């Protein structure tokens, strides 16, 4: 339609030339920022030899609103604030990142564009000038301290990468490279460690698990942060931090941004606050049932056009048997209020001293979410006469839930109450009637779960073990 | 196929000229998408265009040979 109108306009021009249009443009000149942006777009589609690839690097500059100065054909520098880098403020050029060099040498200008975007976002810092340089210095001190704390754990125990990620001080930590900021891997779920039995090695993927990024971000309030490495003296077991003041009251705090917001319960907010003290949610926003938020996080990991419309009755298909799980949100906790929680994306900590405690609470909340999360599925199990064993999850208390199922051999309801005491540790008790058939041994179920993964899965093992006996 | 290539060429020239002229008058994603679509058509059939000519020269040689053989047979 628009194209047809444009063709009609071209026919009108033919009836009326390109030379005449050029003359008209010259007359207008004799008589801007969007044209500059348009230049970058058509220069991005331009792809030719090395000279035009240097003009493609110039296109990348104005695409991200950067300023390009080139000395000789070999060196071109994009400069803004302290974000100045050269492909051949207040700091030396840090490294010839292989990551950036490999992408440029190969035909991946798009990857170089993403890396610049990351650098620009890291330095989106408001501040001013001398304050920005000091604020970056504080981030450098935090990074050095966190790196040392990770090294201490490796010296104390030569743990494999998996142990460090699941149960270690800090976490597997990759030092910042270019735009990407430090990533601490809080948890690696057993089901997702296995892909289609992965052995981590030191080659652990950046996204193969749950990852959190440490960064400095400006805040309305004013806080005191270390401006020099605070682990001057380290006690051989764990760490010792020299007391503040050095430090300055910059109007910002260190942050622990999570790439995908993690649903967290009201009880966790209190347990976490007890240590740090910094308000986790400050301006009290919204707080609805936790089980709904857990479903949204699990369902939205893979996006599909049709909303599941689960009605909290998720259907699961497994190698043996078919199961239906009702998540039972709105079940009253002992207090009389249903488990209620709000997605948290950013957690702010002044020093790393409270960080070991904060992470241990988060690991427990993440682990509980993963076990309950494994059930949430997009199943259209309609009119299923065979099996369709039906289980219901009720929130007995914060940190506890009960999966209720009919006894596999007998007829009474039997309930397994699982409490997520720690991120990697869950304690479960089977409740069975006085007259009943010994359904299972708590240890056999544990062995199967650890070797495999998830909780829709745990119910299968309980049913199979009972049937085998 | 020849007709399709010629149509793609004409569309590309006119639309590229229009986009450049509008940039000049100021100081067009519809035009951009149209350009890349017919650019793919021309480029994919330009490897073909080159080989076609080589194949045509080979065909001419074959034809000459066949003609000679027939005339000789006759």
């Amino acid at each position: 339609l628009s194209k047809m109108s444009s063709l009609l306009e071209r026919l009108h021009a033919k009836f009326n030339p390109w030379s005449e249009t050029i003359k008209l443009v010259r007359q207008v000149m004799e008589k801007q920022h969007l044209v500059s942006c348009l230049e970058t777009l058509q220069k991005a589609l331009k792809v030719t030899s090395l000279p035009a690839m240097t003009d493609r690097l110039e296109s990348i500059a104005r695409q991200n609103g950067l300023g390009s100065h080139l000395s000789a054909s070999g060196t071109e520098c994009y400069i803004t604030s302290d974000m100045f880098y050269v492909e051949v403020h207040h700091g030396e050029n840090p490294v010839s990142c292989p990551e950036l060099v490999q992408q440029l040498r190969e035909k991946n200008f798009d990857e170089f564009s993403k890396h610049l975007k990351g650098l620009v976002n890291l330095y989106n810092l408001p501040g001013d000038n001398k304050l920005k340089t000091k604020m970056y210095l504080a981030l450098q001190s935090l990074e050095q301290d966190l790196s040392k704390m990770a090294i201490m754990y490796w010296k104390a125990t030569n743990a494999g990468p998996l142990d460090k990620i699941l149960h270690g001080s800090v976490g597997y930590l990759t030092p910042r490279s270019g735009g990407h900021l430090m990533n601490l891997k809080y948890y690696v779920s057993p089901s997702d460690l296995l892909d289609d039995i992965i052995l981590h090695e030191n080659n652990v993927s950046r996204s193969l698990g749950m990852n959190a990024s440490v960064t400095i971000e400006g805040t309305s309030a004013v806080y005191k942060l270390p401006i020099a490495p605070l682990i001057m003296g380290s006690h051989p077991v764990d760490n010792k931090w020299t007391p503040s003041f050095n430090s300055v009251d910059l109007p910002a705090c260190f942050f622990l941004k999570f790439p995908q917001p993690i649903p967290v319960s009201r009880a966790f907010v209190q347990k976490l606050q007890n240590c740090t003290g910094i308000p986790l949610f400050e301006t009290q926003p919204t707080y609805a049932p936790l089980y709904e938020l857990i479903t949204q996080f699990e369902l939205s990991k893979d996006p599909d056009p049709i909303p599941l419309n689960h009605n909290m009755r998720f259907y699961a298909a497994l190698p043996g048997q078919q199961h239906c799980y009702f998540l039972n949100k709105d079940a009253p906790l002992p207090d009389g209020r249903s488990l209620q929680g709000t997605l948290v994306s950013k957690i702010t900590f002044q020093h790393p001293g409270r960080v070991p405690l904060i992470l241990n609470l988060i690991r427990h909340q993440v682990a509980y979410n993963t076990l309950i999360g494994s059930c949430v599925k997009r199943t259209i199990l309609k009119e299923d006469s065979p099996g369709l064993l039906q289980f219901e999850v009720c929130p007995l208390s914060e940190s506890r839930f009960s999966v209720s199922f009919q006894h596999p051999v007998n007829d009474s309801l039997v309930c397994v109450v699982m409490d997520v005491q720690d991120s990697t540790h869950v304690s479960c008790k089977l409740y069975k009637g006085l007259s009943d058939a010994l359904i299972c041994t708590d240890d056999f179920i544990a062995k199967v779960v650890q070797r495999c993964m998830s909780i829709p899965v745990t119910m299968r093992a309980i049913r199979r073990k009972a049937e085998t006996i | 196929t020849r007709e399709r290539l010629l149509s793609a060429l004409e569309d590309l020239e006119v639309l590229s000229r229009e986009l450049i002229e509008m940039l000049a008058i100021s100081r067009e994603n519809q035009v951009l998408e149209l350009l890349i679509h017919r650019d793919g058509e021309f480029q994919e059939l330009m490897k073909l265009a080159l080989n076609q000519g080589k194949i045509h020269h080979e065909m001419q040689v074959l034809e000459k040979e066949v003609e000679k053989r027939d005339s000789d047979i006759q």
């Binding site: 390109w18 030379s19 249009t21 050029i22 003359k23 443009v25 010259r26 000149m29 044209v35 348009l38 230049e39 058509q42 220069k43 589609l45 331009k46 030719t48 | 060429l9 004409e10 590309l12 020239e13 590229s16 000229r17 986009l19 450049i20 002229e21 940039l23 000049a24 350009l35 650019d39 021309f42 480029q43 330009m46």
Partner: peptide, 29 residues
Amino acid sequence: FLPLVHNIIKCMDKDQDLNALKSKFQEMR
């Protein structure tokens, strides 16, 4: 063909009429 068209667009961004005439000759080619 497409490279010549992009070069004409780059000339328009820089600004000429001679380059547009060159684009017409490229269409004859």
